[PDB]
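Operator note (shift B, R.M.): manual run for Acyl carrier protein requested after the automated queue skipped it. Running by hand, logging everything below so the morning shift can see what happened. Input copied straight from the record, untouched. If output looks odd, do not overwrite the archive copy; leave it for review.
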Amino acid sequence: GHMSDLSTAPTLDSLRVWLVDCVAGHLGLDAATIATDLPLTSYGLDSVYALSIAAELEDHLDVSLDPTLIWDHPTIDALSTALVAELRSA
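Run finished. Output pasted below as returned.
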């Protein structure tokens, strides 16, 4: 019913959906067929794209990403895991 935001207490569903939804909006394609199970390469984006794009994404969640790290989590599964981790250590 009520759409929960995060209240400093984000949920895996809110993030995971954020990532896929983020790409969908970015490219404009359908989220159900974005690439949640595929890397960013599928978008055919240049290396310079990740810089600005990866910056915009993380800039939205008030966080900074690492260089070799971005190429480490090119998928939503990894990125989401890392994102939720920001709220959960272990």
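Quick read of the result: DSSP finds four helices and no strands in the chain. The longest helix spans residues 12-27.
Leaving this for review. - R.M.
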